[PDB]
Design a protein around this ligand. Structure first.
Ligand SMILES: Nc1ccn([C@@H]2O[C@H](COP(=O)(O)OP(=O)(O)OP(=O)(O)O)[C@@H](O)[C@H]2O)c(=O)n1
Ligand SMILES: Nc1ccn([C@@H]2O[C@H](COP(=O)(O)OP(=O)(O)OP(=O)(O)O)[C@@H](O)[C@H]2O)c(=O)n1
Ligand SMILES: O=C(O)C(=O)c1cn(-c2ccc(O)cc2)c2ccc(Br)cc12
Ligand SMILES: [Ca+2]
Ligand SMILES: [Ca+2]
Lengths: 224, 213
């Protein structure tokens, strides 16, 4: 079934890198492979896909997908607000850094002979929350589904609450792990819809979870 | 020819990541490509190579090279001190982080500034160790640097200062050229080329410095 034909979808993936200076930064360990798989499965099921990607250099660009490359969280926010009016579906699978260094040095900071000094942090904008607001303010008339991602350690108490605070249509919880040897199986993956259905997310390959996420989107797209 | 036969070489390459927590870290933008190429060229020319590898661009382990994967600079220091007594050549091509977070969370942290503590200088520790008779097999210690000229001095002034302050035998300086600065005062331009070909010039320098003796 090519159930995503006629659907224009925008995906973010990978972690952001918040510059401290031209060489150093604060980043996170997200590989981006899971957002890549969602974009790959969407493209394979007929969607017109644009992928905004962060620290994902060694990944293969998915076939049939339009690539937009960013580095920072603010660049991701700026890139999403550009490509979002055209989308029917937003998939926020990127590990957006919640904070960035408050000051960026123009040159690399030389090692002192005396005490080092801290990196002051500043909040980055909530790209998911901004998109949800834009839609509610009538600014995204094409947006049919907004999908968020979360890593949670009940699970549903934290998961159900993120859904209400972000306000998106679906929250993918704990789609983490490659199902690799000696990675903990917390039987914790859930597909949380704003309508209140909970689906369990079988911790399997990145491809199978992507199929589950895209199954859920098309089913949410048909509910309306 | 196989001019590096009989030589045990210990190489660091890539940047380190200093954890804040299981997800976040302080990192740098070093790709590691030039240390890997140095490790690849040394092996091909007969050396027994151990490559201590940190964060890379997704690089494949060079064939025939013993790989040690590290994450942090502290882990990198432990790995170097563990393998150094056996080595004849140390090539410090890793972008070792100067500072690390003062606290590491075991779980993910949901204004605070990040307090930092200084990391050990592994290249300098190696130079002092050799001079203290603790590394009798060490024949060459090679450091790496990327230097710019600025309001405080030109590129070459800053690079020489690095060699003089680090005390190593050879300093491979990037300014896409740069220089090869030797402890005898020899300064060669580093002709730009591929990572492979520039690695060839670096090893030729090491070989030529090994014949110094
Ligand atoms: N500055 C941010 C931070 C996160 N996100 C998005 O919001 C979702 C939730 O990410 P999460 O890591 O849970 O961050 P927070 O919800 O802000 O909370 P916490 O940092 O406590 O985990 C993710 O899909 C991410 O793409 C975002 O758009 N902008
Ligand atoms: N904690 C550190 C920092 C640097 N290095 C090594 O030292 C050499 C020089 O790196 P560089 O950062 O240029 O020297 P620094 O004194 O840290 O330079 P600066 O103060 O300008 O940042 C490199 O081979 C690197 O592998 C190291 O062994 N341990
Ligand atoms: O490995 C790579 O990808 C790479 O290109 C290089 C990294 N550094 C580097 C290492 C640690 C440091 O502290 C400063 C600079 C280099 C220095 C000279 C040349 Br020539 C090349 C590199
Ligand atoms: Ca977050
Ligand atoms: Ca430094």
């Amino acid at each position: 079934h090519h159930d995503m034909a006629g659907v224009k979808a925008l995906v973010t993936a990978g972690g952001t890198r918040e510059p401290l200076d031209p060489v150093r930064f604060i980043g996170n360990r997200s590989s981006g492979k899971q957002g890549y798989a969602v974009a790959r499965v969407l493209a394979q099921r007929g969607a017109d896909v644009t992928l905004i990607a962060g620290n994902t250099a060694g990944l293969i660009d998915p076939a049939g997908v339009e690539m937009v490359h960013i580095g920072s969280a603010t660049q991701l926010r700026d890139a999403v607000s550009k490509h979002a009016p055209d989308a029917n579906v937003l998939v926020m699978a990127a590990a957006v850094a919640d904070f960035r260094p408050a000051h960026v040095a123009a040159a690399k900071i030389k090692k002192g002979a005396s005490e080092p000094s801290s990196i002051d942090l500043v909040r980055n904008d909530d790209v998911l929350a901004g998109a949800v607001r834009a839609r509610a303010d009538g600014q995204l008339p094409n947006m049919r589904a907004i999908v968020g991602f979360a890593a949670e350690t009940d699970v549903l108490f934290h998961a159900r609450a993120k859904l209400e605070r972000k306000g998106c249509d679906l929250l993918v919880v704990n789609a983490v792990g490659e199902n690799r040897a000696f990675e903990v199986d917390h039987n914790d993956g859930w597909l949380l819809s704003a309508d209140g259905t909970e689906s369990a997310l079988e911790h399997g390959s990145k491809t199978l979870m992507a199929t589950r996420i895209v199954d859920s989107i098309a089913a949410f797209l048909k509910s309306q």
